[PDB]
């Protein structure tokens, strides 16, 4: 049956776009960091780019160094870079190709639009030219990330009405460039060999329903989804202390929903990750945690590792 | 400054209450809890709890379906919930428009506009107080910048409008509406932003970033809910290595939070063993926003959650 890990994705030589998403606070940032690290360690001759498309960025916080609109290598690694788009500064560097920039810089949607433009300018870079091999997206929570992924479709339909209107109102080739560019992006996003969406969730009632809507929504967009990370699991029966009323009670809830998840998502890689005692922060800890996306965590075997994170 | 939201809960001036914070810290749980407390404490006022998170969870929280039209919470006389579906709202007023980024924030802004108008006219389906279960930090900031953003935007449009049905008047009409929202949103007695957070590293810096940003918009925040606290030293169970180690970390940051935000109502809420859903469990949970949670005394409530 389907192995409970991301080993196939981590060692993949075909995927160019990897979206990590899900409900607020399930562990998208933690998971996207971990996936990006595993791919980087697993494929040393490739260059990877982890971009946060969440307007409230946490990559800088997680690694303990400042990232921005321009990609920077993670300190300590040779092939992993991070980026956190700043709408104001990104529009400024077009401002200083300056009112326009700041105005549009705060309009709702700007963060989704500039993330999309990042994809666009990456497509143009690949064709002509040496750039990042695989790009992993630390996305915003469900609601807005769905907007982002509708954009190839949304812009395509818009650019049809736009063209026939702007030509009679009153440069036309600039439309065709984007119109074709958007298409290219949609082709790659609906290609399961080039693009995939890794869902993150927690085994709690409120995250269950939202995760299922999300997955269905993505499938409707012809977006490949075949992996689900169930994060922050207690595995209370393996503590070998078997006490703490709260932990046993919460694990009972988790385990219950974990059986429901297992049953519905039989055809998905269902990757189960433990709630750690320490902080998943800094290169070392993120790396130590990431290994369990590659080789499934065993509560009986690797039980001590949740207590072995630096402080 | 007392570690509770009693004054906000019993406030008779506030019209706009934003409940926000990082993803997954407890915005939805807290906003429901705040809305119940206020509705219970003020039975003569009508309360509306609106979700501006495109991934709505109010319906899931209460266990009943809500929509764009306000509906009363079953079991409450003066609390209603609203969850606007963009594609379905525009159909009443273009499905591609319902998929455009920012459309969620726009329709939410229009909803605020509808209510200030009806409140001004003393006519129409109205609510005395609107509480917002907001999207996470990033997009909520975009929403609260909208009065400033739209203001500048309508100025520029003025010129390129005069470039070529008496349209200038409608721009002027919008400028005025926006201006009324800006003054109400920046009035500390009418509007406040309640921050929800958890005592963890990634939450601390984002929360601080958020508050500093809200203040630059002349938005009031004097309330911070620190949620999902373990209180391990009070569990009466001095074991479980994970809880002890996790609590030691929570407690460490908790001292820092308490020191920095001394001017704020710092409300501490426990991690529950049960599920906080349904009116009853939400009501029981919400009591600790009005009267601070004593881990030594109120500890039983952690397991008293209906299932």
């Amino acid at each position: 049956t389907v192995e409970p890990n991301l080993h196939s994705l981590i060692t993949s030589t075909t995927h160019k776009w990897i979206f990590v998403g899900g409900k607020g606070g399930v562990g998208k940032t933690t998971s996207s960091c971990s996936i990006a690290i595993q791919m980087a360690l697993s494929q040393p001759n490739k260059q990877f780019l982890l971009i946060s498309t969440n307007p409230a960025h946490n990559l800088s916080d997680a690694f303990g160094e400042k990232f921005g609109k321009d990609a920077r290598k993670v300190t300590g690694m040779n092939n992993l870079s991070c980026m956190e788009i700043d709408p104001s500064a990104a529009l400024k560097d077009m401002n200083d190709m300056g009112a326009l920039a700041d105005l549009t810089g705060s309009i709702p949607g700007i963060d989704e639009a500039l993330s999309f433009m990042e994809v666009m300018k990456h497509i143009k870079r690949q064709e002509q030219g040496e750039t990042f091999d695989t790009v992993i997206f630390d996305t915003a929570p469900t609601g807005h990330t769905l907007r982002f992924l509708q954009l190839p479709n949304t812009l395509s339909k818009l650019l049809e009405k736009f063209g026939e209107i702007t030509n009679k109102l009153g440069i036309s080739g600039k439309l065709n460039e984007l119109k074709a560019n958007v298409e290219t992006i949609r082709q790659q996003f609906t290609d399961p060999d080039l693009t995939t969406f890794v869902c993150v969730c927690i085994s709690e009632f409120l995250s269950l329903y939202e995760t299922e809507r999300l997955i269905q929504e993505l499938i409707s967009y012809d977006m490949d989804v075949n992996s689900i990370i169930v994060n922050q699991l207690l595995f209370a029966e393996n503590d070998q202390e078997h006490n703490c009323k709260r932990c046993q009670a919460r694990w009972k809830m988790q385990k219950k929903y974990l059986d429901q998840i297992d049953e519905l998502y039989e055809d998905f890689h269902v990757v189960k990750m433990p709630l750690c005692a320490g902080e998943i922060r800094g290169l070392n800890n993120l790396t130590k945690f990431s290994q369990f996306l590659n080789k499934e965590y065993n509560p009986i075997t690797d039980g001590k590792v949740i207590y072995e994170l630096e402080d | 400054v007392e570690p509770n939201l009693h004054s906000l809960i019993t406030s008779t001036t506030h019209k706009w209450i934003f409940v926000g914070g990082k993803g997954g810290v407890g915005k939805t749980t807290s906003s429901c809890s705040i809305a119940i407390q206020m509705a219970l404490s003020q039975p003569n006022k009508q309360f509306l709890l609106i979700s501006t998170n495109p991934a709505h969870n109010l319906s899931d929280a209460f266990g009943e379906k809500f929509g764009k039209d306000a509906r009363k919470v079953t079991g409450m006389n003066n609390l209603s919930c609203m969850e606007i579906d963009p594609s379905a709202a525009l159909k009443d007023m273009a499905d591609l428009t319902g998929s455009i980024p920012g459309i969620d924030e726009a329709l939410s802004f229009m909803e605020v506009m509808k209510h200030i108008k009806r409140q001004e006219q003393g006519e129409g389906e109205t609510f005395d107080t609107v509480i917002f279960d907001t999207a996470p930090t990033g997009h909520t900031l975009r929403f609260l910048q909208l009065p400033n953003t739209l203001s500048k935007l309508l100025e520029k449009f003025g010129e390129i409008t005069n470039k070529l049905v008496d349209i200038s008047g409608k721009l002027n009409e919008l400028k005025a509406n926006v201006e009324t929202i800006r003054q109400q949103f920046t009035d500390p007695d009418l509007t406040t932003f309640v921050c929800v957070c958890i005592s963890e590293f990634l939450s601390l810096y984002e929360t601080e970033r958020l508050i500093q940003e809200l203040i630059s918009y002349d938005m009031d925040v004097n309330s911070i809910i620190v949620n999902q606290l373990l209180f391990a030293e009070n569990d009466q169970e001095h074991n479980c290595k994970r809880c002890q180690a996790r609590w030691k970390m929570q407690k460490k940051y908790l001292d820092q939070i308490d020191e920095l935000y001394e001017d704020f109502h710092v409300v501490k809420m426990p991690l529950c063993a049960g599920e906080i859903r349904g009116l009853n469990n939400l009501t029981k949970f919400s009591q600790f926003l009005n009267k601070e949670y004593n881990p030594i005394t109120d500890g039983k409530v952690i397991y008293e959650l209906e299932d």
């Epitope: 055809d267 | 899931d60 579906d85």
Partner: antibody, heavy 119, light 109 residues
């Protein structure tokens, strides 16, 4: 104590309308999916409609799509089936049944209500 | 799109092992359930997920999957096991519910 109770079945002339009701108890239907399955005389089971309040999604069999409408009042813990443009073929015993968000198999059923369509 | 249930009827005696087959037009993974319907009564759920036995159902009932072929096996017919049986598919990629035509298991004498 989980159970589903149908009602509203009766005789309707072709082209007419009829509203079926499925009262649920023992659970909150909001968190579940509710289905209508019918059975023509001497025939087998035929799914006609589903509703899942927790996703705002509804679904219809082609044979009834556009003519029927499924809905739910979550405050009354009751689901409904509005049948318009009825025909002789629509004659059947109509069941309501329950499904789960992770399992679209029907675990609980009502006793069924008889709808007959003829002039 | 169309679930073919066979045979449409079958005679057997108490103690016989019987097998009912349902063939799916397309791959629906393991999302098939089996029901039992007695005259005048609502169907009862027996098996879901092709092979998982539903709560309260006796152990003589069994289900297996072989590709798009699904089987319901009653290892040793009891007097009460005689009824009509329906398979049902509920594929993850769809919101459709599709039943087989049914199998009427009757007593041989």
């Amino acid at each position: 104590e989980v159970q589903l109770v149908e009602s509203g079945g009766g005789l309707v002339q072709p082209g007419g309308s009829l509203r079926l009701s499925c009262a649920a108890s023992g659970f909150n239907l909001y968190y579940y999916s509710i289905h209508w399955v019918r059975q023509a005389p001497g025939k087998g089971l035929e799914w006609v409609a589903s509703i899942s309040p927790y996703s705002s999604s509804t679904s219809y069999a082609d044979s009834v799509k556009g003519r029927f409408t499924i809905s739910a009042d979550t405050s009354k813990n009751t689901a409904y089936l509005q049948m318009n443009s009825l025909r002789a073929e629509d004659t059947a015993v109509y069941y309501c049944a329950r499904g789960r968000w992770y399992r679209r198999a029907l675990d609980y059923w009502g006793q069924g209500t008889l709808v007959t369509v003829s002039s | 799109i169309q679930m073919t249930q066979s045979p449409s009827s079958l005679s057997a005696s108490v103690g016989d092992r019987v097998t009912i087959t349902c063939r799916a037009s397309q791959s629906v993974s393991s999302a098939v359930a089996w029901y039992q319907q007695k005259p005048g009564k609502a169907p009862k759920l027996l098996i879901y997920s092709a092979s998982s036995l539903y709560s309260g159902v006796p152990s003589r009932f069994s289900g297996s999957r072989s590709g798009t072929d699904f089987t319901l096996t009653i290892s040793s017919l009891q007097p009460e096991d005689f009824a009509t049986y329906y398979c049902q598919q509920y594929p993850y990629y769809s919101s459709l519910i599709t039943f087989g035509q049914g199998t009427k298991v009757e007593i041989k004498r």
